[PDB]
Design a protein around this ligand. Structure first.
Ligand code: BR
Length: 290
């Protein structure tokens, strides 16, 4: 059980070449001096999403490894493109990386962007998560951000730590992805599977039980607002209606074993696509530097 810090930035409209030089290369260079650090992997997808997963020595405090990095990111935010800052960089405790991005296209035009987006959610996402070796699967047309801002003054009063706040939301085992915006603010990713999908649900959870016995809920210390973001790069592929998904790989799993496993499973599903609906696959290679 090692620690792994994953960074996530997004610059919509940027080529893979654009993304790396302006973001990925810059962020890497701001991870200059770290302790317990081993090596750092990064990739720059044509999606417009940068990701620089970090890796530390065995016996490292993950939450403190994470807390440590955020402040080098504090210095890094300065240098990134305006819109990348506006988008928000997400720091998450995971060792998974994107390896495949699949676009589902309507050759006819008999299915609009949101029709296709739904079919992916219902039929495709779930059976591929069952594939041995899959860390996570993101149906972009079925996902969105929950921006959770935090009052300084409040957080000061409780003597609470943000680490607890993170785990408090992961404790319910809702199939959600919990990250942290560097620069306070937090950001969660919601799927179609998630147990909590609305801010009411987010506000109505208990982070901590006090010594006086009262319940502490998010809305008292955190302001929960929806984050308007476009998670899918695709409304059209080759001028044809399309929606896509990202395929993250589990930490220990072998890429190629799983890569075949999902695609062969995918081509098992591909036999019964509605007429017109095809798919286009792009492999997402990942750089390695130490
Ligand atoms: Br096409």
């Amino acid at each position: 059980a090692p620690p792994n810090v994953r960074i996530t930035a997004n610059y919509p409209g940027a080529s893979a070449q654009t993304l790396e030089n302006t973001v990925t290369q810059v962020i890497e260079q701001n991870m200059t001096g770290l302790d317990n650090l081993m090596y750092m992997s990064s990739q720059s997808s044509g999606t417009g999403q940068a990701t620089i997963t970090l890796s530390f020595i065995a016996g490292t405090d993950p939450d403190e490894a994470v807390q440590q990095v955020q402040n080098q990111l504090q210095s890094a935010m300065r240098k990134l493109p305006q819109a990348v800052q506006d988008q928000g960089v997400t720091v998450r405790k995971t060792g998974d990386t994107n390896i495949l991005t699949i676009a589902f296209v309507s050759t006819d035009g008999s299915m609009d962007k949101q029709d296709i987006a739904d079919y992916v959610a219902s039929n495709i996402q779930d059976p591929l998560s069952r594939v041995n070796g899959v860390g996570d699967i993101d149906a972009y047309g079925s996902q969105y951000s929950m921006r959770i801002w935090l009052d300084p003054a409040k957080l000061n009063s409780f003597q609470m730590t943000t680490k607890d706040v993170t785990d408090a939301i992961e404790s319910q085992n809702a199939q959600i992805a919990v990250g942290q915006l560097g620069g306070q603010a937090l950001n969660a990713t919601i799927n179609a599977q998630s147990l909590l999908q609305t801010p009411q649900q987010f506000r109505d959870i208990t982070l901590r039980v006090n010594q006086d016995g009262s319940e502490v809920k998010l809305g008292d210390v955190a302001t929960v607002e929806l984050g308007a973001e476009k998670y899918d790069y695709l409304s059209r592929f080759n001028g044809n209606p399309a929606s896509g998904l990202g395929v993250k790989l589990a930490s220990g799993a072998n890429e190629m074993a799983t890569a075949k496993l999902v695609l062969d499973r995918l081509n098992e599903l591909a036999q019964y696509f509605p007429h017109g609906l095809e798919y286009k696959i792009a492999y997402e290679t990942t750089s390695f530097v130490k």
